[PDB]
Symmetry: C5
Subunit: 103 residues, 5 copies
């Protein structure tokens, strides 16, 4: 019924998902990597661009003081996640399915 | 719960969302758009007004020190989001049945 | 998820709700007029159920932590109170 | 659905006996009066288990937290605050 | 539906194996012995899925931010690890 889903968005490398209509992910958590190594008083932004949109929406900020945040977000069949951290950012959640077996 | 939705509420500019399709917005997250671009110790209020009712309700506060919060809100029909920040505020979630 | 629901609890005025098949889901509690409250105070928010004389704390508010989210169902009869000098906004949704 | 709540008094673990509690919210009482910069731990023990799980910490700086927890037939909530802690949610 | 919880001891990744049809919903990650950990250090908490050698970060913990809530479903095989000197508690519920 549920499968774990997760991506590491590396610095300077937006993560693009291109799938068929009806593909969906529930994104739950966004976490800053290498907290000890990022510049101490900086805030980083995480963005989502939907479909062919040239402009994104901010989904939240990351910093030493707020180094992860929870969200209740559904992402559809075409999206791109980006951020401006020097560290990786981890976006995790789950897909939801019905299932039947023939044994 | 299968339609990403977001709006950017610009400073001084309430954002009206008018839904006539019987679906709703689930607001999930409220974020300050540019933490660097706000007065350092000030707190900003975010309001929602429902339909043509004149009374608004706070959905939360924002500041450089506390620049986002998660929420679980369903908003049908017509609503208006406003705030008094000098920065843009992003309300993000999904449209659902 | 049926419909937006919200109340403003004014200072010194506990807010009573009575319901029938209706449920209120409280989602968010927010401190009003943050700039005007004393910077070093914490305010307590209570719910009293039915005829109870004493409440349960649902949370604290302060200039430093001026709202909090919750996942609460409130049924037949409840009263929300707090000791802020400003209004407190409790919002969520009603279902049926 | 109905509202469910307990006040766990200082030094007094609170024992609860098909019915299920959803614990939603844990709040520190008398925030202004507890020790500055101290963190208090909240525990749950399930059934007859002698050793518990932490469900969270409370302090002046973080004086409540939300949780999504289902608790079954038999459990005990404890904490080490000098003030009361309020655990609320709903029963199903 | 039932309570589920594990204590991940320092230096000891905790491997969970489940039977077909079981799911763990992780709800809360809490730092133990907050008063004893290094004052200004941040600890990373990881989940490794199935046979993956590398984990995904699920969050950070510190004395200043000593727990976080999460909405995660975990399946057949997963491993939780962290680099704290104290235990970390992952709790939630199991369904079938």
């Amino acid at each position: 019924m549920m499968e774990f889903w997760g991506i590491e968005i590396k610095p300077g490398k937006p993560f693009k998902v291109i799938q068929k209509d009806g593909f969906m992910v529930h994104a739950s958590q966004v976490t800053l990597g290498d907290v000890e190594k990022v510049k101490k008083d900086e805030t980083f932004a995480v963005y989502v661009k939907i479909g062919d949109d040239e402009n994104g929406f901010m989904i939240g900020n990351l910093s030493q003081k707020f180094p992860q945040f929870s969200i209740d977000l559904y992402l559809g069949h075409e999206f791109e996640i980006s951020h401006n951290s020097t560290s990786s950012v981890y976006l995790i959640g789950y897909r939801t399915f019905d299932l039947e077996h023939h044994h």
